[PDB]
Amino acid sequence: HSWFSLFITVTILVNCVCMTRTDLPEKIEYVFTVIYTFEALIKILARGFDPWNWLDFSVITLAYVGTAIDLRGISGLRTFRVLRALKTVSVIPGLKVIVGALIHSVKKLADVTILTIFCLSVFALVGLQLFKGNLKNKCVKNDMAYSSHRKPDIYINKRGTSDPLLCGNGSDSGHCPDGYICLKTSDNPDFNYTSFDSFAWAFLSLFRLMTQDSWERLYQQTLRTSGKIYMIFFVLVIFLGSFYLVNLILAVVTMAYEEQNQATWVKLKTILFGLVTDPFAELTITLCIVVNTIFMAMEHHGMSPTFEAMLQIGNIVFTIFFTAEMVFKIIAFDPYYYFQKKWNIFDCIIVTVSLLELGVAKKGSLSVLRSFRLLRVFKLAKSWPTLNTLIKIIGNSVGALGNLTIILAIIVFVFALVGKQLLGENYRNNRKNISAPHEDWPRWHMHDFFHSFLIVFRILCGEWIENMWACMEVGQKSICLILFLTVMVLGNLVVLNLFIALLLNSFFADVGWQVRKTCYRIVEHSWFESFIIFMILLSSGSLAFEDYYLDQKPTVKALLEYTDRVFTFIFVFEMLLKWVAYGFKKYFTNAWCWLDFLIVNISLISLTAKILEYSEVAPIKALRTLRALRPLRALSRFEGMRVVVDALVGAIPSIMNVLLVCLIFWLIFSIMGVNLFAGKFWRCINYTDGEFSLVPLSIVNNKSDCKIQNSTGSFFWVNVKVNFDNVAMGYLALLQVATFKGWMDIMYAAVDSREVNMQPKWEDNVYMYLYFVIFIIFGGFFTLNLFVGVIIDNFNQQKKKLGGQDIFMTEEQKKYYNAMKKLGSKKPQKPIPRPLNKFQGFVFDIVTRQAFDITIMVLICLNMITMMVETDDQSEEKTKILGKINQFFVAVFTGECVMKMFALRQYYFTNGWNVFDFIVVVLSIASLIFSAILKSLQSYFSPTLFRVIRLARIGRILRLIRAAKGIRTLLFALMMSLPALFNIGLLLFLVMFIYSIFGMSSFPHVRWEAGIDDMFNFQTFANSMLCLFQITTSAGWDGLLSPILNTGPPYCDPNLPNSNGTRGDCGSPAVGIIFFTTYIIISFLIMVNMYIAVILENFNVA
Ligand SMILES: CCCCCCCC/C=C\CCCCCCCC(=O)OC[C@H](COP(=O)(O)OCC[N+](C)(C)C)OC(=O)CCCCCCC/C=C\CCCCCCCC
Ligand SMILES: *[C@@H]1O[C@H](CO)[C@@H](O[C@@H]2O[C@H](CO)[C@@H](O)[C@H](O)[C@H]2NC(C)=O)[C@H](O)[C@H]1NC(C)=O
Ligand SMILES: CC(C)CCC[C@@H](C)[C@H]1CC[C@H]2[C@@H]3CC=C4C[C@@H](O)CC[C@]4(C)[C@H]3CC[C@]12C
Ligand SMILES: CC(C)CCC[C@@H](C)[C@H]1CC[C@H]2[C@@H]3CC=C4C[C@@H](O)CC[C@]4(C)[C@H]3CC[C@]12C
Ligand SMILES: COc1cc(NC(=O)c2ccc(-c3ccc(Cl)cc3)o2)cc(OC)c1
Ligand SMILES: *[C@@H]1O[C@H](CO)[C@@H](O)[C@H](O)[C@H]1NC(C)=O
Ligand SMILES: *[C@@H]1O[C@H](CO)[C@@H](O)[C@H](O)[C@H]1NC(C)=O
Ligand SMILES: *[C@@H]1O[C@H](CO)[C@@H](O)[C@H](O)[C@H]1NC(C)=O
């Protein structure tokens, strides 16, 4: 009956929340059981008058019997309860269609994994070959004076961290300080879980790199242990590893999703005067909203009392005005008509909350309620189409797409509860191992439901491997692997499905004339143009020599002085020649000649100051910094870069408007964050030597007390570098949370936040995490959907304007594209003629059959399996046996190739696959003899090159893609899309170079802190390039911004004994803030364009 079902639905709802709650008093569960056994009895009576329900009854009876002996315990009983409690949730009419839709998504992704795991295995084998046992390298002290190791190996900790320092014996690897030599130890960096020593560890590391979870940490470790050059590895892999796989995941799901939805008296006078309401009143309302917004966006830590009083008076006046509009409108319409509109109820509730706050006015009382007035900006949407669109996206997410949100929330809840129950006792009895040095609890644990939900949400943000390391050290490793991997895969699947759906559904539902002629002819000629291109390239390249060490090279500096003056003379003459050749009107109406003119003007001003006695003046020294804009002249010449920039310029107008709405939305969040956290991020630290430790609340609980106890001089009252004290800084804080780098530091301070001038306490405001959660869900998450949708429809309209012509490719790249497209479609090639000779004919008969081909593939698979068993520090005998096996394999493949050549004389060389195995065979033979000759008869070179010589066995592995249809097709799609990626990568390389010049001139001095160390700094072109590549993907950009945000002790030496240029260990916060933010935004736009190009390419191929 209906009443029976409703009883069942409510009791299970009680359990959802009942398990969410710990410390059951063993009285709630009993009251629940009495009820469930009565329901089971009546169900049995009905049944006499499904097997799963029968099994549930058996489980409950088993628990009833088990209360006497070994009560509770094990782990599984609670997890068995939740499945039964979850069936009712699953029964919702709409959820079943959605999960059926999702199964198709995993069936479509099938082909992608076949290729994803193949690529991960191949690059994991490469990484195993190159870096096995290199992450075990550590800086070990020497001895003064022999049995085994002299005492325990005393390592050193890198500045600012407790981790042992990783070094190398190479020139570009990394070196130990004085009194320290590199030794390969037995312990690996993180928890002995980060390595390249075996195929399992290498596969885990490559999977971490594919998702880019803290990948910059592994980047630095391997480049510090092996050498800077191996960054190229990490470059080639990172792009294909993350970018390419996402290209497929998205396309392969997006089409699939589209597929399915392609299948489907005085009162009368008051009423009159209220109806008298005219458009001149609406403008007043909007004006009041804007002025209130700007007044509320004017709060900061350092407000004067008069400043605060004026803000308070203004806020009251506005609240009175809005209450006035309420009382006018209610007695203008009727309240039944009034309370029928959707916006009227919203206005009513906001102003009611505002009046309630005006009533109970305590300093800090429910500050969240003081920011609901900000919601009134949403009323500024009936005239702004974009804000309305954002609201439509959210409403579509809630109402029409509600089932996806429900399944995502249920997945998060179920997995958090399951992990809490399985792993919970472990995080309390083992908490010492995974906690920070001076803390007594891990910051991310699973003892209680809130923290389990936080860990699940953080995994949904892409940060899972560190928490996995923490849990594998506290509990069972297999449980961690299963839990974290399933959570990550399943949650990312659901989130991408929700995101793509929302975009697709909401968004898409007389002598002078002769001289002029001669000059024009001279300019038009191609040699002149090539000369100018060559000069631009040389001018750009010379800028890459002006690093921190130029002052030590006396000749180089002088050479550049001449190089820069002669180049300036060249371009001024070139401008003069063009001016005479084209004419003034044509020149000054070109939009490229203006760029050349401005750059030449800057260079000429710098040179004129250099010749004069104004080289040291403040503004000229700032124009000298704009010598990094010279490479843009190269962008002018090259046509691919011109095409890409033209697209960027066409897109810009829409990104302007979308950007404005994002700023308005963030401004709301920043005002809320200032209301909550402004001035509460200050805390005392003990700074002794490059390391700061938070002063404990026992000895010092108050600001004043640090001054009282500062006998040593080591105690400093400091504020977090990025904070909500100021609204502008708040946007930077929000940006870090949206990027997901540096988001944690801001959050920990907010959770520890207490009253102003009060020492922060461990997790005293633990429910402030929710605020950040809401931001991530509503701000970055909603805005990014709008941003992507706007970019997509802009792309569609622009390509339709072209006539559908593909953008990002030059005209000759179009011809290459057409030829490459025609290549892939030709089926017939004709049968190859049979050999006339009996012996050649017999070899032909042997080689032509499919059995030979299958035998060759299974042999290569065996070779692959033989290659997966290589491990660091394995044995001598194992190495010899593997070498003999490799010799047998190479002999077999050599013989096979010879047989093929005999059977197929010229037809062999005709096919490209045949050319490819021939090349791999020759490479393997050359590798095998080469390695032997240096060892046998030549001076012993570095072993690390041998590790590179044996990289010729991977070609035999890549021979397999001959057989697989999906992988071959995907590879063909990538090949087709390469030409446009070339131009976009050229633009990205130019941007990186310019930024490197800007960083190498503006940031080399900065104290080594956080990301900035002896290898990743801005003192050299290569060092800046490494930093730029790392932040290209936004990884670890807060780590480089942090040292630049330092403006005094204990992080700076006010004047310093040795620094003429900046006179400090100080970095420029405005420049750094501007420099880092601009690059990430530009890189994000470029990478979005690359996504668009390759996904369109995949769609055309499919
Ligand atoms: C920041 C970044 C810095 C720079 C990063 C470096 C960028 C490197 C970029 C790309 C490198 C790989 C790209 C080329 C892949 C070529 C694969 C290939 O060209 O094959 C596919 C074709 C397909 O032919 P289909 O009949 O199936 O038509 C397909 C039927 N439809 C029309 C439906 C598709 O096959 C053929 O053309 C047969 C003729 C070709 C035979 C030799 C070609 C294969 C040689 C090597 C391939 C190994 C690729 C390894 C990729 C990484 C793996 C870990
Ligand atoms: C800062 O905090 C400390 C500790 O709470 C305050 O010192 C206490 O003040 C009360 C006042 O009745 C005494 O009874 C306690 O014995 C004091 N404890 C001490 C000495 O730590 C201190 O007054 C607060 N104010 C300042 C100076 O900022
Ligand atoms: C708690 C605060 C910060 C979040 C924002 C307030 C939310 C929860 C409330 C306040 C006013 C409410 C809106 C008032 C108007 C309507 C009626 C109908 O047309 C759709 C729902 C909708 C649009 C409501 C959605 C939820 C709503 C926006
Ligand atoms: C019918 C066809 C045209 C619809 C195609 C929808 C495509 C273009 C949508 C669906 C999902 C979207 C992607 C979702 C996530 C990201 C990651 C972000 O960092 C770059 C943009 C990118 C890559 C989006 C680009 C646009 C996108 C790929
Ligand atoms: C080397 O080739 C490239 C790889 C990437 N790869 C990425 O993996 C990535 C992930 C997240 C982001 C990203 C996220 C947020 C912001 Cl604000 C900026 C960037 O980028 C991106 C490239 O674009 C230039 C080029
Ligand atoms: C580094 O070189 C020193 C000799 O300078 C040597 O003793 C040490 O073992 C080397 N370490 C490695 C792993 O190369
Ligand atoms: C934590 O360290 C203790 C030693 O204090 C050790 O016994 C235990 O095994 C460690 N944790 C785990 C999960 O092994
Ligand atoms: C704090 O500073 C003192 C020196 O004044 C030092 O001796 C002590 O070890 C430091 N402690 C911490 C917590 O870093």
UniProtKB/Swiss-Prot annotation:
Per the UniProt entry, what is one GO biological process?
A: cardiac muscle cell action potential involved in contraction
Q: Where are the II repeats?
A: 265-509
Tissues where the protein occurs:
Expressed in the dorsal root ganglia and sciatic nerve.
Question: How does this protein lie in the membrane?
Answer: Multi-pass membrane protein
Work out whether the entry's keyword set contains Disulfide bond: yes
Please give the GO cellular component terms listed in this UniProt entry: axon; clathrin complex; extracellular exosome; glutamatergic synapse; plasma membrane; presynaptic membrane; voltage-gated sodium channel complex
Topological domains annotated Cytoplasmic: 96-111, 334-341, 388-403, 585-590, 639-657, 793-845, 905-910, 969-983
Intramembrane runs of residues: 199-223, 449-469, 728-749, 1021-1043
Q: What is its main location?
A: membrane
Q: Which reaction does it catalyse?
A: Na(+)(in) = Na(+)(out)
Modification type Phosphoserine: residues: 825
Where in the chain are disulfide-linked cysteines found? 139-176, 471-480
IV repeat positions in this chain? 832-1102
What does its PTM field state? Ubiquitinated by NEDD4L; which promotes its endocytosis. Phosphorylation at Ser-825 by PKC in a highly conserved cytoplasmic loop slows inactivation of the sodium channel and reduces peak sodium currents.
Q: Where are the transmembrane segments?
A: 1-21, 27-46, 51-69, 76-95, 112-135, 231-256, 274-298, 310-333, 342-361, 368-387, 404-424, 479-504, 522-545, 559-584, 591-612, 617-638, 658-685, 766-792, 846-869, 881-904, 911-934, 947-968, 984-1006, 1072-1096
Glycosylated residues, chain numbering: 169, 192, 433, 686, 702, 710, 1060
Entry keywords, A to Z: Cell membrane, Disease variant, Disulfide bond, Glycoprotein, Ion channel, Ion transport, Membrane, Phosphoprotein, Repeat, Sodium, Sodium channel, Sodium transport, Transmembrane, Transmembrane helix, Transport, Ubl conjugation, Voltage-gated channel
Annotated compartments? Cell membrane
Q: Tell me what disease the record lists for it.
A: Episodic pain syndrome, familial, 2: An autosomal dominant neurologic disorder characterized by adult-onset of paroxysmal pain mainly affecting the distal lower extremities.
Q: What is known of its domains?
A: The sequence contains 4 internal repeats, each with 5 hydrophobic segments (S1, S2, S3, S5, S6) and one positively charged segment (S4). Segments S4 are probably the voltage-sensors and are characterized by a series of positively charged amino acids at every third position.
Q: What is this protein called?
A: Sodium channel protein type 10 subunit alpha
What species is this protein from?
Answer: Homo sapiens (Human)
Q: Which gene encodes it?
A: SCN10A
Portion of the parent chain present: 129 to 1728 of 1956
